[model samples]
Target: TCPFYKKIPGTGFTVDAFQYGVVEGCTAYFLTHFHSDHYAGLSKHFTFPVYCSEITGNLLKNKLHVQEQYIHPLPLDTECIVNGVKVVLLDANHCPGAVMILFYLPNGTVILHTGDFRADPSMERSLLADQKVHMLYLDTTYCSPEYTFPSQQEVIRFAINTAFEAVTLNPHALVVCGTYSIGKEKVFLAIADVLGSKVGMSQEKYKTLQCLNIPEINSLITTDMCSSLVHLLPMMQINFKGLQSHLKKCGGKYNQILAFRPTGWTHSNKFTRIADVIPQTKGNISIYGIPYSEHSSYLEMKRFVQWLKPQKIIPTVNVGTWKSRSTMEKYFREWKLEAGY
Candidate 1:
């Protein structure tokens, strides 16, 4: 996490590096997605030619006010030569614009930089089949065994069913869905469709979500909180104190509040589930932490690393201590054994 691989070895490409934004030892800047932690240091002042998917590039231009001239949008699934290194982009399944970057240096060495991906089976067949990867820069956000939670689809369905149950109790209960700037749109969208409800968000956020290009999504969104029963708010504003202030502001638009805060840590099964993944109800407030992780689960990561079979693995996240890396290495060793290596 402390600026590890801010600059890729044997290449001039600096990935997701505004932390290393200086023009000292870089030829190009590559961004995998539009998340805050990934695009932390980008601004209008960046002079380097930045390569990202077109959707991410648009967010950089519109949301962050990054210079358009310095931006070079790359097509997904097509191999393009970036200063002699063969580059390919594959869907990451983490977010709309997220990608797993592939770079083949001049000497036939294949290097993969999985920039925050949710690993799946299709990636092996469609992305890279029978190709040897020399170095794999992995997204180890949920690398450990404790994070083996439910799939995104299952979690979404759980949220929808629970939201329906919560609404059945009180017809006018205000349903609040928690999200980040870009992730977790699917949860709120499905909830709106199931309940035939409207979702409220900031006009600025609405514009940014437009860049994600989900068809017919415009119909479910509204800027007015008074008109919409369900609101798509960021994580910060969906808490107890935050809901208290919002309830006071609403002035009895609804009697009770039902909220779903979706993240990986919330569903570790470390007690707190009354009926094992049920809602937590306290008087007028009902809250549920849906296991909606954008990162790969422990099971999925095993499938990915076994197939890819890289000789060297460097984690892109959750490596604060040497033993943490050692734990990941142990998993990799076991996976290699399963891979018949």
Candidate 2:
């Protein structure tokens, strides 16, 4: 039984057709993004040749650190045949270097797997434009009304403003924030660009930010090259607390410390209380929290699925709730598809 038919026999996970044992003798093609939901069960269990985008591959190696055999890097939008299964990787707007896979079977079935994609115009223009996608396997994570997310730019501006206010109040404090390392690089760059020559980054962060191709922002300054900014700007790095400690030891006077991340003490409503847990080091520290998510909103998810109009929609990676399934059922039921029965 495939993921569409029966639940996983033992682990209660849904089994894809590749793991149904029918495709064991046949070559199975696996295309994935870097999210844990996409590759949680794919480490030592399978032997299929996985196809992913270059960015996703890098994340797999650098972040997830899954060094498995048969992992191949296939450039996006290029079709490749593996044991008669034609697969293509397309950019998914959910995260940097994430890809949604297109599967074309010789038997004439065309399947498009939207691996947690968002409706980012840039990503859509890059990956899908007037493209015909058949038999879509979609992400309905935000299908329910309970899901909500602010605009990316809006969230970034809010976070930046929060950081600015905090730092302006207490300039000599160390700030630490959490992020996905690669994806949130742009947020920091944006902050630097706005602050105008007041942001400095570590060597590793500099290199990573350079790759983002936001030329105007990355060109401003870096910790290694910009000696003038060393005394004034905040230090950017991959490590959270390590950078804070390093800054403190360097005796750099920071009036307000600002950290850019998806989540940390800032995202939680109890940011001030959470900041108290961070072991105060000698300065007045104010934490500014903002919610910056890479995923799609409920309306976007619902609209995208409606546009695809797939024969059936299966919601993967249940996050302790079946609201997505319920929403999909409700939406489809309105169209007389006999949903939820």
- TM-scores for every candidate against the unseen true structure: 0.92, 0.66
Q: Relative to the unseen true structure, what is the C-alpha lDDT of residue 76 in candidate 1, on a scale of 0 to 100?
A: 93
Predictions in order: lDDT: 0.82, 0.52
Model 1, span 60-173: residue lDDT tens:
998888988999999999989998788999999988889889888777888899999999988978757747889899998887777676678877887788788878878878
Q: Which residue pairs show collisions in model 2?
A: 167-256, 170-255, 170-256, 171-254, 171-255, 171-256, 172-254, 172-255, 266-289
TM-score of 2: 0.66
Residues 1-341 of candidate 2: C-alpha lDDT, one tens digit per residue: 34542231112222233335434233444545555545555544455565567766555555444575666777777878655456677777666667777666565656666776775545445434545555666665555565665677776676556555554566444444444345555455455444444445556555544444344744565665324222222323423355556556555555434444354212333233322323233243333345566667766765565555556555554534576466577765564353222
Candidate number achieving the greatest TM-score relative to the actual structure: 1
Record all residue pairs in model 1 with backbone atoms less than 3 Å apart, i.e. clashing: none
